[PDB]
Amino acid sequence: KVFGRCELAAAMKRHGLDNYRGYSLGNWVCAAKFESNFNTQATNRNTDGSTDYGILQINSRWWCNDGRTPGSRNLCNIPCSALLSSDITASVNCAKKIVSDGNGMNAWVAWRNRCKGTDVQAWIRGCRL
Numbered sequence: 001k002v003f004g005r006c007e008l009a010a011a012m013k014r015h016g017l018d019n020y021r022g023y024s025l026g027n028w029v030c031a032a033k034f035e036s037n038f039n040t041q042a043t044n045r046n047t048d049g050s051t052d053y054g055i056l057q058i059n060s061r062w063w064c065n066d067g068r069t070p071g072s073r074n075l076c077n078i079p080c081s082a083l084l085s086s087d088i089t090a091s092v093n094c095a096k097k098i099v100s101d102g103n104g105m106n107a108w109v110a111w112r113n114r115c116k117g118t119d120v121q122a123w124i125r126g127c128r129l
C-alpha cells in the first residue's frame, strides 16, 4: 500500500507514535517519506547482506527475521514480511523499540541527513488530525 501524507499521519497517531520518546508526528512522517516514499512494500538490500523492510526500512541485522542474514538478531520478534503489510501495526511497534535503543531517531540515517533540524511540522500541515 502507498499511503497519502495526511493518511499516514493519521494512522501513525492512532497507533501512538505522535510524540513517542519526544519526537513529534512530523518527524515520523518525514522519516517515512525519505525511507520508503510512503510505500509499505519497499525493500532494499544492504552491502553486508542484510535487508531493510517497509515504511520505515527496518533492518534484518537486528530487528526482524528473514532467514538469510547470518549471525543476526530478531529483537522485534517478527518475520520481516510482517513489516510489508498494508496494516502498519508491526512497523510502528518495532519502530518504538528502535527509537528507545539509546540514539533516538538517529538510528534512521535518512532522518538524520534529511529531516533532523528542518521544519518537520510542514509534513503534517493542513491535515485533519
Ligand SMILES: [Cl-]
Pocket (backbone or CB within 6 Å): 005
Ligand atoms: Cl508527499
Ligand SMILES: [Cl-]
Pocket (backbone or CB within 6 Å): 024, 025, 026, 027, 120, 121, 122, 124
Ligand atoms: Cl510536527
Ligand SMILES: [Cl-]
Pocket (backbone or CB within 6 Å): 065, 066, 067, 068, 069, 070, 071, 072
Ligand atoms: Cl537469518
Ligand SMILES: [Cl-]
Pocket (backbone or CB within 6 Å): 068
Ligand atoms: Cl535470497
Ligand SMILES: [Cl-]
Pocket (backbone or CB within 6 Å): 073, 074, 075
Ligand atoms: Cl533475537
Ligand SMILES: [Cl-]
Pocket (backbone or CB within 6 Å): 065, 078, 079, 080
Ligand atoms: Cl520468523
Ligand SMILES: [Cl-]
Pocket (backbone or CB within 6 Å): 011, 086, 087, 088, 089
Ligand atoms: Cl494501518
Ligand SMILES: [Cl-]
Pocket (backbone or CB within 6 Å): 021, 022, 103, 104, 105
Ligand atoms: Cl532522543
Ligand code: NA
Pocket (backbone or CB within 6 Å): 060, 061, 062, 063, 064, 065, 066, 069, 072, 073, 074
Ligand atoms: Na534477523
